[PDB]
Amino acid sequence: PNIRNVVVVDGVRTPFLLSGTSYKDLMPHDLARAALTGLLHRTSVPKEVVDYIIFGTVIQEVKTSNVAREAALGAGFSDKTPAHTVTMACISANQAMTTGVGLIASGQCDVIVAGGVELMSDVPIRHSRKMRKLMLDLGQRLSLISKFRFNFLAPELPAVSEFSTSETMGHSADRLAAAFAVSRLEQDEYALRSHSLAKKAQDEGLLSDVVPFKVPGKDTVTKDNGIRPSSLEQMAKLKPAFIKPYGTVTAANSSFLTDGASAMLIMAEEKALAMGYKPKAYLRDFMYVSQDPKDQLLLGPTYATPKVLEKAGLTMNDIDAFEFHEAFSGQILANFKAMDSDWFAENYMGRKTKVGLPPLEKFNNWGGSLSLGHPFGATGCRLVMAAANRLRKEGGQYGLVAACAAGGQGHAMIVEAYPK
Amino acid sequence: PNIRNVVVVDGVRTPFLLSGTSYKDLMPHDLARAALTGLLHRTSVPKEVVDYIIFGTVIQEVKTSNVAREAALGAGFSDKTPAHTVTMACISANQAMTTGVGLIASGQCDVIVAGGVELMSDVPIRHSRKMRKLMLDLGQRLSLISKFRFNFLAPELPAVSEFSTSETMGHSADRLAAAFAVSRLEQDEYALRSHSLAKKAQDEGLLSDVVPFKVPGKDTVTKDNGIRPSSLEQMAKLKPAFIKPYGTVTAANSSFLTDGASAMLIMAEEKALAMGYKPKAYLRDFMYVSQDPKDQLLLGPTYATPKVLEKAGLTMNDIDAFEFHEAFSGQILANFKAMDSDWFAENYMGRKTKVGLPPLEKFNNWGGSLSLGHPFGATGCRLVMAAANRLRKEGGQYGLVAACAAGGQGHAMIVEAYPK
Amino acid sequence: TRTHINYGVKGDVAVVRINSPNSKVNTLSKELHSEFSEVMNEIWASDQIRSAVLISSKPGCFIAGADINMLAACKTLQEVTQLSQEAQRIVEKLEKSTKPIVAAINGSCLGGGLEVAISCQYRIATKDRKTVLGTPEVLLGALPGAGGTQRLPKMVGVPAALDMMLTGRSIRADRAKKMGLVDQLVEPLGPGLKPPEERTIEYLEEVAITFAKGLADKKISPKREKLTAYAMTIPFVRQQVYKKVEEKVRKQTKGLYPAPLKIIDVVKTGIEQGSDAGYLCESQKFGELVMTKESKALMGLYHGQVLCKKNKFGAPQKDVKHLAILGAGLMGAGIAQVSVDKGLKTILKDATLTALDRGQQQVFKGLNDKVKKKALTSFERDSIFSNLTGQLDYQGFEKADMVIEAVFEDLSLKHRVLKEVEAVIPDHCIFASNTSALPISEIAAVSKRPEKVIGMHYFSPVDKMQLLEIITTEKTSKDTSASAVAVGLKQGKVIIVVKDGPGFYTTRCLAPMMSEVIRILQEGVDPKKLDSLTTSFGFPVGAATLVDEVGVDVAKHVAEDLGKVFGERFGGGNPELLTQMVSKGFLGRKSGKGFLNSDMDSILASLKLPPKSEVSSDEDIQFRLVTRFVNEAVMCLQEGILATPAEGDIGAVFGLGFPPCLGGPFRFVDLYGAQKIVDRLKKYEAAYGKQFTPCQLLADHANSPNKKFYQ
C-alpha cells in the first residue's frame, strides 16, 4: 500500500494489415519508428524526459539486432535513453509492460515506452546448417575449403512449430478444441460475433487508438483490413486446412498472417500529476504462468486467472469488463467451457469450483483478435487501451486482460479505471 | 532500507572456446542446456523451486525462438516456470540479472536464473530481401510467381556494424584509442598483463566457476583455449587489420570470435537463509546509461560510474576491487586516461573532477576479457562471480562491475561481499 | 619573416603550418607566397631535417583558390601573364625535390590548392562531409592558378578528369580514393582531452610524420581497371575522343561560352606535343580569357554570391526550430523537401488525405535519389524523413513559432485563412506567405499582430534553383527580418531583401518579358524556331518552356494583376490571348505534351491581326526582349526597390533564368554600355512610342559624360 503507483498514458497503435498489402515493402524496424513517432505526436512530452524505452519482436531481423536502440534513435530521441528488446513467442509486448512496471516500482527511473513490432511478411529463410561453413572462405586454402561439395543446397524453413513437440499451432488448436466438446456450429457463433461487432466498431469510429502513417513505397495511407462479415451458411463450406476434413478449425475462423506495431507510455503517478497529463488507468498486479506443452498447449489464460484474483484479493463475477485474447475460434470458448464445470480445476490444482465464470456479456465487445488480425508479437499492447477506453466508456472500474502464448506461457493482469 | 535484499549463488560458466574448435558442431540452444544442467549439478536445489528463468542471446536462431523456454524444458525443469529471452548487443547477460533483481524486489516471486548463451560460429547468412518473396509459392499462379527473374541471388551478410553509423567495431575502437593519446607501446603493456595473469590464474586452478561437459560430436571434454602469453617484441610485428598500418589496433590485442554460455542463480535473502544455502554476495544498486553513437561509441563504463557512486552514496577510491570489462586493448586504458584528467567530465556533465581514479592495482587481476575470450552476449554473467569469489579471496567488501556495449549502452553495478 | 607560415622541429621533421588570422579563411595570394618562398629554400638549405609536411593549422578549409580581389585586381596584359607565368615556377620548384615532402587535406580544398596538392608526392585526406575537393576553374571561367591541368591527366587520366576539371563540380573525399588523387584516408575523431575538433587538426601531423620517416628510407612507394585499359592506349583514337568532347561541350551548353573550350586546347596540345613546353601556352591564354568580356562581370557575380550568403541583419535573436506549412501541393511539399534535412522540425498542413500522397512522395522521392547517389547514409535518410509529420487539422500549432502559407493564390480565401489560423498560434511567431502576385500590405492590415508578418517567395522547382526572396512591409521589425533571414541562410539558399511595391520584383520583371512571348507568334514565325532563337542568345530554357514553366492557370492572373494598375501601357503592351488558350482548356505541364498541337494557328487566323511589317530579324527580337527586360530591371531602384542596386541581379540571374556569361541586366551599362542600348531603342524609336519608353535615371548619365553606376 506504500508501493508507488503506475499509469498507462495514450496507447498508439498503427493499424493491422493482412500480409500481402502495403507492408510487404517495409523493413522490420521501420513501422516501429512509425508507431513511436505517432506516440510522440499525441503526447506532447519533451523528448528528453522519456527514460527507458523497451520493445519486443519475435523475428529479430539480424542485420540490425536490438531493434529498440536504433528504433528510438531513428525517431530523433535523445540518445541518453538505454533500450532493449524482449523476445517471447506471442505475448512479447505485454511482457514489455510488466518488465517496465517492475522497472518503475523498483524506484530508480521515470517513464517507460513499451511496444511490440513485427512483420510476418518477410520470414527469415536461412541458408543451411553447412553451406554457412563457407564463412571459412571469408590462395589454395580458398580452393580447398571449396573442394568438398555435393548437392546439399536447401534453405531450411522457420516452420512455426514451437519445437518442444514438433507440431504446428493448428494441431494443438483443434486438439484442445475437440477435447472440450465443441461443435462446429457452436465454434462459429463466436466467429460471427468477432466480426459483427468489429464492423460496427469501425462504423461508429471511436476505436481511436490508431495513427495513420504513409507506406513509403505504395500509395496513400493505411486503415485496418481484416474485417469482413459473412453468414453462418457461407462459413461451413470452407474446408478445413489444418487437418483432414473430420476436424473443426478452418481458415475462416482462425488467425491470419498480419503485420503491425504498437506502443504506449507508462508513467509514474507522481510525475503524471506533477507534469499534468490526464492518465488513463492504473496498472495493478500480474500473474505470469506457464503450462506443459504436451497437454495444455493453448490453455493459456484460464490456468492463470484464479492465481491473479486471489493475488489481488477479489472475486471473479464482480469484475467489470474482461477481454481475453484469442488465437483461434473455439479456443476461447473452450476457455469458456472447461472452467464452467468441475474436474479441471480438480486434478490440476487443489479444491476450487467454477473460478472461471465469465458471463459473456462483458466480453470482447470491441472485437479482439480475429477482428482486426493477430500480430504474432504485438497483441497485448493493443489490448490494454482496448480495456482502458472501453471501461471508461461504460461504467465499472476493474478489468482483467489475459492472453495465451505459443509455448504454454499465459499472461493475466488487472487494469483499473481512471483515477478521477 | 526496507527493500528486500537479493543474493547471487554459485555461478556456473561453461568454458570459452575460440571458434573453429569443438563448438563448430553445436546447436545454439544446446550449450544453454549444458550450462543450465551444470547449474543444477552444484546447487542441489529441487527443480520445482526455481521460479522464473531468463536468458539472453544476440543471434536468435529462428528455428527455435525464445531460447529460454525450451532450453529450460530440455534440462528437465518442471514446466510451470515461465521464461523469456532478453536481447541486447553486448551486455545481454548483465541485463538479465538487473531485470531479475527488478523482478525479485517487486515482491512477487522466489528465485531467478540468469544466463547468456551464444555461438558466433554459425552466423545467420540469410537469403535475400526479394528471393524470400518466393514464399508466395508456398498451377499457373505457381508459374507466374516464378516468371519474373533475373540474376539477383545474393546472400546478404550480418556485418556487425551497429547500423546507426554503418561502420564496424574496430573503426570506433581505434578512433577512441587514438583520440586519447595512446601509443602502441602503452597499448600493449595491458595486453601483456591480460595474458600474464591469465596463465597464472589457470595454473593455480582456483578459477573454479567452470563446469565441463562433453561436445557430442567431437572427442572428450573442454577447457578454456584463448590463453597464450608472448613477448612485446613478438607483438608489434603483427600488422593491424582494422585499418591501414598507421593505426593502432591489431588482432593480437583484440577480441576474437568465441562461443560459450553462462548461468547463475539469484535468490531472495530470506529464502536463502530459510533453505540454508551459503550465499556469495548481495546485489546492490545499478545505473544503466547510454551514449550517442557518433562520438562516444565505446566510452561505455566511465560515463556511468559516477552516476552509480552517488546513487549508492560512497566514493571512488574506497572501493575495494574493480573489474571493468574490455572489448579492445587500449579502450580500457582510454577508460583510464580520459577521467584521470579534467575537460571530459567538464562539458559532458557539470562540475566534477577526477571521479574516475582507478589505482590499477585492484584491477582485473583474475584476467578479464582478452584473457579467456569475449563472447558477444555472455560476458557479465561471467563477471559477477569473478568479482565475488575474487573479493572474498582477499579482503575488502565492495566492488563495481561495469561493461560497455556495441551501441552506446553502458552498465555499472556494485556488488558487496558475503553477508557473514 | 613568419607572419602566416611557420614550422618547428619535432622528430627532426619540418612541420610547416598555414594560417591567416585576418580573414576567416586563408587565400592564396602574393602576400602569402612572398613568405612561402623563403621558407622551403631554407628547408632545401637544411640537412638534419629529412622530410617536411605542410598543413592548415587554422580550422576549416585548406586554402582558397585565386584570391578574389587579386585576379580581379585590374592590371595590363603583360603583367597578368607575367604573374600567371611566375605562379607555377614556384610549383616547378617543389614538385621534384630531392628531399620528398607530404601535404595533407582537412578542408574544402578548392582552386589553386590542388596546384599545391597534386604537385606533391603523396597527399592525405580526412573523410567527412566538410572536406570537399573541387576545382572552381570553369565556374568563374578561367584556367587554374598554376596550370595543374598539365599533370592531372598525367596522374589520373584524360577521360577520368576530363569530366572533372570542366564540369565545375566538386567531389567528396570518399570517391577520391577510387579516382586516385588522394590515396589514403583517415576519418576524424570525436571527444578528446582538447576540444573535439582541435585534436583532429593536430592528429594529422603525427600520421603525416609516421608516413614521413618511411618516405625518407623508402619503406612505402608512391607508385599507387578502366583507366588501365586506357593507360597506354592512345595512338590513333586521338581525334576520336576530343572530337566527341568538342561536340559534347556544345550540346550541353551552347557555343557562346568562349571560356571552357579554351582549356581543352591546353589538354589538346599538352598531349602529343612538348609537355614542359606546354606550360607556357596558358600564359598566352589565361591573360586572354580573364581580360575578356565573357567573365569580367563573373567576378562581381561571385562577390555577390558570397555577399548575400550572410546574415546582414544584426544578430539572430530567438532562432526557430519548428515550422508550419499551410497547404500541400508543389510549393509546400516542395519547400518541405529542402527545409527538412538540416535540422528543422516541420508540420505540413493539408485539407484532406487525398493530397498528402502527392505530398510526401515528393519529400521521399526527391530524397532517396540522394541516397541512390550515395550522398547520405541509408539510415539518416529515414530520420530526416521522420522529422516531417503531416497533420490534418490543427493539433500542434501551439508549439509552432514560424508559419508559411502555401495555398494557391487568391485575395479572398487567404484573407479568411489568415483569420482562422491566427488563434491557435503563439504571439512570438512569424506569419509569412509565398504569394506571387498580390502584395502583402494589402493583407498586412487584417491580422491581430501587424509587425510579425513578412513574406518569403520561393521559386518553382525548389531543389535545383538556389535562392529565396524576402518581402518586407513598412511594419517589419528588425528582429522579424533577422529571424526570417536566419531561416533563409540556415536553409542555405542565397537571400535577397526587397522593400516591396505593386508587383514586387521577379514576376514584376517577368510579366513584361512574358507579355511579348506572345508577340513572336503574334505574327506566326513558328515558335519552335524561337526556342533555338532564344537559347542562342543565352537563356538556358526557351520562352515556350518558360510559359510551360510558369503554369498556364496563373498566367491569366499575372496578366491581370499589374494590368489592373499599369500593366496595360508598360507592364505589357500586346493583346492578351491566353484566355483564348485556356478557353479550350489546355493544361500546361500537367497535360504533358507542350506546344505542334495544331491549334495555336487558329488563334492568329481567327481575325487577321498580323498584317504587320517591320525589319525585325532574330537578333532584333532578341535585343527587343532583352532591352525591355533591362528597361524594367533599371526601372527598379528608381523608386527605391532596395538600398543599393549592386545587390540586384544576384537574384535576377540566378533563379529568373537570365544567362550567365552575360553579366546581368543591371550589368549592361558597363560592357555593353547604356549608350549602345539607347542607340538600339533609338533605332526602335518610331515603332510604337508607348511601351518601350526608357527610364530617366539611366538615360541622363548614359552616353556622353562617361558615367557608370558605381564604377
Swiss-Prot record, chains A, B:
The modification N6-succinyllysine is found at residues 24, 218, 237, 239, 278. Its EC number is 2.3.1.155, 2.3.1.16. PROSITE patterns: THIOLASE_1, THIOLASE_2, THIOLASE_3. The keyword Transferase applies. The modification N6-acetyllysine is found at residues 24, 239, 244, 278, 294, 307. This is Trifunctional enzyme subunit beta, mitochondrial. It is linked to Mitochondrial trifunctional protein deficiency 2: An autosomal recessive metabolic disorder of long-chain fatty acid oxidation, biochemically characterized by loss of all enzyme activities of the mitochondrial trifunctional protein complex. The disease phenotype ranges from a fatal form characterized by early-onset cardiomyopathy, cardiac failure and early death to less severe, late-onset forms with myopathy, recurrent rhabdomyolysis, and sensorimotor axonal neuropathy as key features. Residues 125-166 dip into the membrane without crossing it. Heterotetramer of 2 alpha/HADHA and 2 beta/HADHB subunits; forms the mitochondrial trifunctional enzyme. Also purified as higher order heterooligomers including a 4 alpha/HADHA and 4 beta/HADHB heterooligomer which physiological significance remains unclear. The mitochondrial trifunctional enzyme interacts with MTLN. Interacts with RSAD2/viperin. Belongs to the thiolase-like superfamily. Thiolase family. One of its GO terms (biological process) is fatty acid beta-oxidation. The keyword Membrane applies. The gene is HADHB. Pathway: Lipid metabolism; fatty acid beta-oxidation. Its main location: mitochondrion. It catalyses: an acyl-CoA + acetyl-CoA = a 3-oxoacyl-CoA + CoA; butanoyl-CoA + acetyl-CoA = 3-oxohexanoyl-CoA + CoA; hexanoyl-CoA + acetyl-CoA = 3-oxooctanoyl-CoA + CoA; octanoyl-CoA + acetyl-CoA = 3-oxodecanoyl-CoA + CoA. The record marks 374 as: Increases nucleophilicity of active site Cys. Keywords: Acetylation, Acyltransferase, Disease variant, Endoplasmic reticulum, Fatty acid metabolism, Lipid metabolism, Membrane, Mitochondrion, Mitochondrion inner membrane, Mitochondrion outer membrane, Transferase, Transit peptide. The active site is at residues 90, 404. It holds the Pfam family Thiolase_N. One of its GO terms (molecular function) is acetyl-CoA C-acyltransferase activity. It is found in: Mitochondrion; Mitochondrion inner membrane; Mitochondrion outer membrane; Endoplasmic reticulum. Mitochondrial trifunctional enzyme catalyzes the last three of the four reactions of the mitochondrial beta-oxidation pathway. The mitochondrial beta-oxidation pathway is the major energy-producing process in tissues and is performed through four consecutive reactions breaking down fatty acids into acetyl-CoA. Among the enzymes involved in this pathway, the trifunctional enzyme exhibits specificity for long-chain fatty acids. GO terms for cellular component: endoplasmic reticulum; mitochondrial envelope; mitochondrial fatty acid beta-oxidation multienzyme complex; mitochondrial inner membrane; mitochondrial nucleoid; mitochondrial outer membrane; mitochondrion; nucleoplasm.
From Swiss-Prot, chain C:
The modification N6-succinyllysine is found at residues 10, 24, 130, 177-178, 194, 213, 262, 285, 293, 309, 365, 370, 374, 399, 419, 464, 478, 528, 593, 612, 676, 707. The record marks 457 as: Important for hydroxyacyl-coenzyme A dehydrogenase activity. It comes from the Eukaryota. It holds the Pfam family 3HCDH. The modification Phosphoserine is found at residues 275, 378, 598, 704. Pathway: Lipid metabolism; fatty acid beta-oxidation. PROSITE patterns: 3HCDH (PS00067), ENOYL_COA_HYDRATASE (PS00166). The modification N6-acetyllysine is found at residues 10, 24, 93, 130, 178, 213, 248, 254, 262, 285, 293, 309, 312, 365, 370, 419, 464, 478, 499, 528, 612, 676, 683, 707. CDD domains: crotonase-like. Keywords: Acetylation, Disease variant, Fatty acid metabolism, Lipid metabolism, Lyase, Membrane, Methylation, Mitochondrion, Mitochondrion inner membrane, Multifunctional enzyme, NAD, Oxidoreductase, Phosphoprotein, Transferase, Transit peptide. Its EC number is 2.3.1.-, 4.2.1.17, 1.1.1.211. GO terms for cellular component: mitochondrial fatty acid beta-oxidation multienzyme complex; mitochondrial inner membrane; mitochondrial nucleoid; mitochondrion. InterPro entries: 3-OHacyl-CoA_DH_CS, 3-OHacyl-CoA_DH_NAD-bd, 3HC_DH_C, 6-PGluconate_DH-like_C_sf, ClpP/crotonase-like_dom_sf, Enoyl-CoA_hyd/isom_CS, Enoyl-CoA_hydra/iso, Fa_ox_alpha_mit. The keyword Oxidoreductase applies. The keyword DNA-binding does not apply. The modification Phosphothreonine is found at residue 354. GO terms for molecular function: 3-hydroxyacyl-CoA dehydrogenase activity; acetyl-CoA C-acetyltransferase activity; enoyl-CoA hydratase activity; long-chain fatty acyl-CoA hydrolase activity; long-chain-3-hydroxyacyl-CoA dehydrogenase activity; NAD+ binding. Mitochondrial trifunctional enzyme catalyzes the last three of the four reactions of the mitochondrial beta-oxidation pathway. The mitochondrial beta-oxidation pathway is the major energy-producing process in tissues and is performed through four consecutive reactions breaking down fatty acids into acetyl-CoA. Among the enzymes involved in this pathway, the trifunctional enzyme exhibits specificity for long-chain fatty acids. This is Trifunctional enzyme subunit alpha, mitochondrial. It comes from Homo sapiens.
